[PDB]
């Protein structure tokens, strides 16, 4: 990955998380489970949806009959007409192919970016109250219940709470 998160230091994805693209996996006294961050997920959805719609909706065409008929003494303008149709084919095929190749690359980087952004927003909040393992996991040096976990997920986590 360009930003080094997806297929980066975070090695794999979670099949266990069905409600969003990006999220958290908490494990504590009460149990373990998956929860998706809806802000980062919804923002990504809105972005990609605008991207797909842009590629589709910016295409507008006027009513045209491509076919043309020529007799055996008209061969030259028949080949001219063929050069036009073939020319538009060469142009549109080449551009479409690359447009997908390039934007597929950009889309994956957009996801890669969002995952890293989410990671270091959490790093920023936890600071030294947790251990940075690598693999996208933070091991708490204190007790964190579902109320405490949600504070991290909500971005409301309180650092000057846990000295412990």
């Amino acid at each position: 990955g360009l930003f080094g998160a997806i297929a980066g230091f975070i090695e794999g994805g979670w099949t266990g998380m069905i409600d969003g693209w990006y999220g958290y996996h908490h494990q504590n006294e009460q149990g373990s489970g998956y929860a998706a961050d809806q802000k980062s997920t919804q923002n990504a959805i809105d972005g990609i949806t605008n991207k797909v719609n842009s590629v589709i909706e910016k295409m507008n065409t006027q009513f045209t009959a491509v076919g043309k008929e020529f007799n055996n003494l008209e061969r030259r303008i028949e080949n001219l007409n063929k050069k036009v149709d073939d020319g538009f084919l060469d142009i549109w095929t080449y551009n479409a192919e690359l447009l997908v190749l390039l934007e597929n690359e950009r889309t994956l980087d957009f996801h890669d970016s969002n995952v890293r952004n989410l990671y270091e927003k959490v790093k920023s909040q936890l600071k030294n109250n947790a251990k940075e393992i690598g693999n996208g996991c933070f091991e708490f040096y204190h007790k964190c219940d579902d109320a405490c976990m949600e504070s991290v997920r909500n971005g409301t986590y309180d650092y000057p709470k846990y000295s412990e």
């Binding site: 979670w14 295409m59 009513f63 934007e103 996801h111």
Partner: protein, 321 residues
């Protein structure tokens, strides 16, 4: 206790290509390329296409005997010819500006055939009964339905003069023909006049025709030829026919309003009552996507034709279960 940062994964087998890496498996994707058609020939802009059956545009217009079971509408958004349209001009010769006429008739909003020069009262001194084995229908010699073969009545072909004024308030399409015998003996046998001529004129059209007499290879058994000419008569304009022989006279003509920017489709696909914004000879397609691999030749507002077998756009992220 532990909290972890991660991303979605699933059983998705979908694959896309990127600039850096081929065949990446992703969780979600959308298709930008239309790969499917309905296998039908549908209505464009709410109107069905013209179906000529056993005949092509030439045969239909001239009234080829095999074209007389056709049911044509007042209007069509385009014209459909099939692999089964074999019946053109049955009498060998050149159709002048034929490709042009086809192009210009591709779409019309008001179409009626009418009798421009009535068979009964128009030609009292000439014989209208001429037929040929080349135009045979049901094993019997026949002729065009919309034209009349004028020959001498009882020893002479008097100079004829006939005019039509266009009161139809729209363009009138007038077709006629000129017959060229292989020998001078046949020329006098039919029209009696060696010096015969055909002259046609209007505000926008003027021409003169003389019989070209010569030996030619037999086409459909005939060494003779018959050339076909046409003009679009403006509203209010007059057309005048003068001939001393060799004229294939207009019987029926067509009054019409031309559309624009349409064409002809050659397809054996069945015509149905469905609707589409984009028509291909293979079938109608959905115009919502920017690209289609269905056919290079289309009529409508259509996605751009590409050689691509696959255009697939990554929406989701890399799938790693």
């Amino acid at each position: 206790d532990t909290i972890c940062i991660g991303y979605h994964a699933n059983n998705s087998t979908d694959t896309v290509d990127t600039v850096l890496e081929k065949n990446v498996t992703v969780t979600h994707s959308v298709n930008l390329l239309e790969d499917s058609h309905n296998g039908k020939l549908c209505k464009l802009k709410g109107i069905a296409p013209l179906q000529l059956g056993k005949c092509n545009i030439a045969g239909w217009l001239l009234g080829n005997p095999e074209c007389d079971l056709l049911l044509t509408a007042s209007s069509w958004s385009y014209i459909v010819e099939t692999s089964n349209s074999e019946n053109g001009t049955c009498y060998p010769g050149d159709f002048i500006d034929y490709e042009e006429l086809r192009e210009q008739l591709s779409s019309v909003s008001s179409f009626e055939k009418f009798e421009i020069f009535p068979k009964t009262s128009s030609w009292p001194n000439h014989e209208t009964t001429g037929v040929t084995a080349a135009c045979s229908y049901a094993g019997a010699s026949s002729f065009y339905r919309n034209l009349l073969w004028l020959t001498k009545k009882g020893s002479s072909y008097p100079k004829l003069s006939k005019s039509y004024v266009n009161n139809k308030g729209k363009e009138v399409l007038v077709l006629w023909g000129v017959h060229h015998p292989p020998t001078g003996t046949e020329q006098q046998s039919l029209y009696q006049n060696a010096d015969a001529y055909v002259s046609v004129g209007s505000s926008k059209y003027n021409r003169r025709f003389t019989p070209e007499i010569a030996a030619r290879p037999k086409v459909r058994g005939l060494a003779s030829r018959m050339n076909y000419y046409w003009t679009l008569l403006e509203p209010g304009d007059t057309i005048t026919f003068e001939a001393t022989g060799n004229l294939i006279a207009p019987w029926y003509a067509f009054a019409l309003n031309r559309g624009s920017g349409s064409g002809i489709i050659t397809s054996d696909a069945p015509v149905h009552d469905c609707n589409t914004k984009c028509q291909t000879p293979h079938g109608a397609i959905n115009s919502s996507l920017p690209f289609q691999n269905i056919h290079p030749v289309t009529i409508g507002e259509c996605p751009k034709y590409v050689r691509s077998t696959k255009l697939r756009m990554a929406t989701g992220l890399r799938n790693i279960p």
